[PDB]
């Protein structure tokens, strides 16, 4: 009984620690604010579960029922259960809930940024000012001969 | 005299079990019926979703 | 032919969005029930033991 009272009293003392989460101003660059451990661990558990759900969705759209994918799904679910149970045993329920509230707020701001970026493109009339869309990603320079018509001919 | 010492030990362990279980149950009580003490919720079932 | 296959893909994705919206509404309802079940177990089963 005494050992159980000590365990519950430790969870109560852990609950009393206020978790500071950093303000999401969108224009403020890269600065070094350390992410709360609860926010990281809840994000990684949610991201592992999201990857699992996405793999189930991609396999439902691609009619290629490759049978060797079921064993890998069971392993991914057990790995998620063990990590989720670890998170529920390492972090207090209040901190886990506050980390989920922060994750939901971040997801809501990503959707609002996507709404504003597409509205600014419709008000420019047809003048083709191909200005500086800069950064991303890819060009995997390998490929062979083929004739592909550079199709951004207006 | 030995039996009277053993009787005091037995009564102490009986009282410690009573106090131990009352302390244990104080963690499960809902914050509405408890006075103003900072009853920070310990369980997920005690948090307002 | 690619335009027709892409229309069929758009319809499959649209059906899946409807399933996910319905699934998330059900999950929200189930979390609320699980909270009430845990509180009711504490009240009916755990809280009486100190008197016995």
Automatic annotation (TrEMBL), chain C:
It comes from the Eukaryota. This is HAUS augmin-like complex subunit 5. The gene is haus5.L. The chain holds residues 411 to 462 of 666 of the full protein.
